[PDB]
Design a protein around this ligand. Sequence first.
Ligand code: GNP
Ligand code: MG
Length: 632
Amino acid sequence: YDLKRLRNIGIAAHIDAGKTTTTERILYYTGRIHKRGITITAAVTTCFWKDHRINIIDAPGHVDFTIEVERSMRVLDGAIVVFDSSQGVEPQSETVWRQAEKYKVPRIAFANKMDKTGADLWLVIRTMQERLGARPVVMQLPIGREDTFSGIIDVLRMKAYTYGNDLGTDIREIPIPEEYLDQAREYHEKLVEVAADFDENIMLKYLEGEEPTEEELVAAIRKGTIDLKITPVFLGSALKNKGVQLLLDAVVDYLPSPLDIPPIKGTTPEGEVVEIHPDPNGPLAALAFKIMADPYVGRLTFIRVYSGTLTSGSYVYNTTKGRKERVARLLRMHANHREEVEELKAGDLGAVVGLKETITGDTLVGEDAPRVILESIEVPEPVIDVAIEPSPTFSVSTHPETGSTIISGMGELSLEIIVVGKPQVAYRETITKPVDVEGKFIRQTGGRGQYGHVKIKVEPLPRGSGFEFVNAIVGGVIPKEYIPAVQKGIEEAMQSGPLIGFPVVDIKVTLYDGSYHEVDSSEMAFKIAGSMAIKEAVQKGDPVILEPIMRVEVTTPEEYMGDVIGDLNARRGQILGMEPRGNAQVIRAFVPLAEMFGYATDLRSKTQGRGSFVMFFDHYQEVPKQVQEKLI
Ligand SMILES: Nc1nc2c(ncn2[C@@H]2O[C@H](COP(=O)(O)OP(=O)(O)NP(=O)(O)O)[C@@H](O)[C@H]2O)c(=O)[nH]1
Ligand SMILES: [Mg+2]
């Protein structure tokens, strides 16, 4: 174990770019030494390359636009960004890129599919400059083109490589062929010129015409990469097994260890925000980031250790839940087998066996360690509903729309992870003026007399105040044995209101009068009496509809910046602010959830596919008269 030799990485790309085949070839090359039909299912997979441990953190999720991604991004240290060489940086690659600096994560690029017709390194470079404002450094040059792509020039070390087959079984270092020498020389000088910006010493040699050392140049490019200022570009063909080992070399060379990235923050008991340094002999602090029901050992919990050491066969403490846990065994997942380990130290990742109450996002500490918390406990709201009848916001409930069960969540595509219904907004209903009404069920039904009679007062309560019920009955006017029945009825009717059928929310109900019959009264009669009363009260109380208003962040290139604002205002929005993020602009806005349906598509049609958005429930508000009348 040595912290400097760890490379915690994620591979990021468009859906067609080659993330999976680049991953699997990586696992191939890394596992040849010493060491059924599946798509690699393991949140973190460990492997070895030139005396370094590479932990590949997978981010499957789904549509990868979710806020779930930031956990994946906080658990890894660096990224390889994979471009498809025919296209340059792609609309989503532009968003995928936009996520990475949104999280201060050092990245290298991999210009993939260099074998495919259209493949052009230069189109990748120029578009990274123009669209992403990236400052790419040309680290490699291709030998041949498309179908003739056969070799790669390393312009840092001025070496070339040629590939005999497409199988990854024949690699040979070769001299830079003569017709690429001028270009190679020219791009070497450019790379020295970049490196000179990060090392005074190198600038001087550049001016004097002295060649710097491999070590210096690698260091200077490493500095700039980690400092987020440059992006070394590498190229190849994962499918035709060319460029992959040189990519792995670049992971070691330029990507950060856990010491190279600023440390994670924690909230202590006393409430302060403290930094936590990767010290293995410090107290234990770990974060769970995915749970898997694997067959062989049952519930697995994957963790990243930030400080201290997690030991097999000991007790830990879950600070997010306030609970003892027994770590029965610790495991690592390799490409073909699982390994039982005695411990897991700071800066490392693995899986734990035997945990019971630990969910993803939860903090684990040593038994006598400081009780710190790493991820804000915020528990979001249930704003969308889906009738899916043919705990992390896949909540399941049963109420109105008899014989239909619902899956409530938030974020159109974001709640859609379990998903035969269509997405509906969670409207509420309330009154705007106090009323005073009666409920009366006086009937001959079911072999006997039935009689219930309640009078209630109903007021609206400040927005968000909830429900209040008061019983102001005097001298058994309604017999005491029946009050629970009438409460029960009031509650039942408040589940479905008068305008559109949704729960009633911010009202105060006061039961103040009524009457009964000495033989004919019963619990059933007073239940219905109360239910009748509240229905009438909500109709008479000049009722209004409350919709949820979302907080929205849209990131868009400046040229479309006028067209998006136009569109947001057409969606009954209010434009709150606008602060830049790279050569992009982020527009914050309030907008109704009713107006955000299929927004991902309109934004991409008004933005040439390069803009994206995130969304959060903020508050309930009334619909204007127009929208209410129309909501029928
Ligand atoms: N010509 C060529 N095709 C490639 C290369 N790498 C991948 N492909 C092809 O491109 C397609 C996408 O592969 P894949 O690894 O699934 O990409 P992905 O980004 O993982 N897909 P997704 O994210 O949707 O699961 C496949 O047909 C794959 O074989 C390459 O280097 N050259
Ligand atoms: Mg894939």
